Design an enzyme around this catalytic site. Structure first.
Site, PDB file in Angstrom:
ATOM      1  N   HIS A  41       3.070  88.671   8.368  1.00 29.99           N
ATOM      2  CA  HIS A  41       3.802  88.660   7.114  1.00 29.99           C
ATOM      3  C   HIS A  41       5.239  89.122   7.273  1.00 29.99           C
ATOM      4  CE1 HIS A  41       3.849  93.022   6.265  1.00 29.99           C
ATOM      5  NE2 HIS A  41       2.532  93.099   6.382  1.00 29.99           N
ATOM      6  N   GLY A 143       7.853 100.303   5.231  1.00 30.83           N
ATOM      7  CA  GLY A 143       8.329 100.252   6.587  1.00 30.83           C
ATOM      8  C   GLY A 143       7.295 100.606   7.634  1.00 30.83           C
ATOM      9  N   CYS A 145       4.467  99.041   8.212  1.00 32.31           N
ATOM     10  CA  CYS A 145       3.643  97.960   8.739  1.00 32.31           C
ATOM     11  C   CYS A 145       3.859  97.772  10.233  1.00 32.31           C
ATOM     12  CB  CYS A 145       3.907  96.638   7.989  1.00 32.31           C
ATOM     13  SG  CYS A 145       3.488  96.717   6.241  1.00 32.31           S
TER      14      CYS A 145
END
Ligand SMILES: O=C(c1ccccn1)c1ccc2ccccc2n1
Ligand SMILES: [Cl-]
Ligand code: NA
Ligand code: NA
Lengths: 305, 303
Positions: A41, A143, A145
């Site tokens: 993503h 932030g 991920c």
């Protein structure tokens, strides 16, 4: 003495974290050999995220659209491909800090250490269990991920988790390093919910054994029980079934403490039906279920890495 | 979101951990630049447990009596000296993995990460707090002496603790990296006992603020309190006094959540009176005191 929620030393993994930027999105990547792993993503705008077609989104991207920074050193991306929900960025340099590692997929009830990262920089480490509902009760800000979860087994790092998203209840969801979600989730901005969770019975038992090893034994009693009788009680209290393999796994601790699993199960039965009566166990007023039997053995034996 | 007891990533400290052997005793050392720091009680024999004369024991040692092993490599000890309760072994190699670092002595209530080590190799990392009675509630087995506690701020490691001993209550005692003990303890096996331990009030308050930030308000109430009335009540539950310094420290979190510090003090007073009545706060059925105000802001807001 003492018993703490303890993570694996994180140094071998810290040497692998990098920053990945695509467009306006920056998140973390895992650099092993000459591939950087991160959530697919990363390539989505916010409206893409509503209903993404990842293969379509990806074909428009060139290698130079992926900015990868290892420390303050840029890494040259020379290829890109997707595996399930994880983007693999081929880079022109092998990570000289690559540890001995494997990708493993863990089972609900197993624990692992999370290395929470922001902008490629390790920021915190903590221990998590994979819940029976396949979420993890993490601590993650925007932030985070691409932060990863791992165990260490001898000198080998077993990577089992990559962080992808936060569910509306504040618990967390991600994939193994092969991009398969834990749990019935998808990487899309859409209504998703965690199923009703349950308690990891074998882990609670392990933690009661930890308590006994550490001198905390007021909950022990003269009684024992049967698996069938105990599991009927566990079902009533939204506790996972205790299986024969769980009993076998606790064998070491049962022999070391003098308390058989079904003997300790009778302790746990009474705790569920009557509560704790103002008392605590290892400083907790709740029954703790994020220590596996191996965690307890490892901590009460001082295994190193 | 979420709220977890979280430790600093340990890699910068792992690269400094060595094994120090003197006689039949092996424990852990911290190797920074060309010095290895370790508890001076590594030089004690079984005869020296109660009333060691460390100056007399040390003068009898040669450099080659200290065996220092970094991974698979033996380091050459080329000098040695004592600073308070820490031994400083000069070695003939600067550690190439030495981080940016400093030594800081911390105050009770401060939190830090511990890298538990055995035979110079890291076993695990956890978070803990300096208790009001200057002990820590660690997880330490035989062989863990010389394991250190630390914070990391940007790229700089602040070493604040090195582990020396376990008291009979199963709590732990140690020094700063200048070798001064936290608390009234000494590196002797003579009978020692920690003062009665109390709850770190400013930290409980911070954690209640963390619970509000993460969306929980069930424990708030319409009341306020004076600071003195708060302390008069809280002391009866073995809580540390809350000072005006503490109220000031909670200013940022107060502003962020819109709940005045003494308003939150009134919520805490009610929790002590009522218990949780089966509810939880951030996953706990007890009030948590090992998150500082600084920790809460970092965990909920980042940098
Ligand atoms: O809670 C935190 C923590 C970490 C280690 C020890 C104690 N607390 C935390 C959480 C998010 C962060 C984000 C960027 C930088 C630092 C961060 N630290
Ligand atoms: Cl301090
Ligand atoms: Na029993
Ligand atoms: Na080492």
């Amino acid at each position: 003495s003492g018993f703490r929620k303890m993570a694996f030393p994180s140094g071998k993994v810290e040497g692998c974290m990098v920053q990945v930027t695509c467009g306006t999105t920056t998140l973390n990547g895992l650099w092993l050999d000459d591939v950087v792993y991160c959530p697919r993503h990363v390539i989505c705008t916010s409206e893409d995220m509503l209903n993404p077609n990842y293969e379509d989104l990806l074909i428009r991207k060139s290698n130079h659209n992926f900015l990868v920074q290892a420390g303050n050193v840029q890494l040259r991306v020379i290829g890109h491909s997707m595996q399930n929900c994880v983007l693999k960025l081929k880079v022109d340099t092998a990570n000289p800090k690559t540890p001995k590692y494997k990708f493993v997929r863990i089972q609900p009830g197993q624990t692992f250490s999370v290395l929470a990262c922001y902008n490629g920089s390790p920021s915190g480490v903590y221990q998590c269990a994979m819940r029976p509902n396949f979420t993890i009760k993490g601590s993650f800000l925007n932030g985070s991920c691409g932060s990863v979860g791992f165990n260490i087994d001898y000198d080998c790092v077993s990577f089992c988790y990559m962080h992808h998203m936060e569910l509306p209840t504040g618990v967390h969801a991600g994939t193994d390093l092969e991009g398969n979600f834990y749990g019935p989730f998808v990487d899309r901005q859409t209504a998703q919910a965690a199923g009703t969770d349950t308690t990891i019975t074998v882990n609670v038992l392990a933690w009661l054994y930890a308590a006994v090893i550490n001198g905390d034994r007021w909950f022990l009693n003269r009684f024992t029980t049967t698996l069938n009788d105990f599991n009927l009680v566990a079902m009533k209290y939204n506790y996972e079934p205790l299986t024969q393999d769980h009993v076998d796994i606790l064998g070491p601790l049962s022999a070391q403490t003098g308390i058989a699993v079904l003997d300790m199960c009778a302790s746990l039965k009474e705790l569920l039906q009557n509560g704790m009566n103002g008392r605590t166990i290892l400083g907790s007023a709740l029954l703790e279920d994020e220590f596996t039997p191996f965690d307890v053995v490892r901590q009460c034996s001082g295994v190193t890495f």
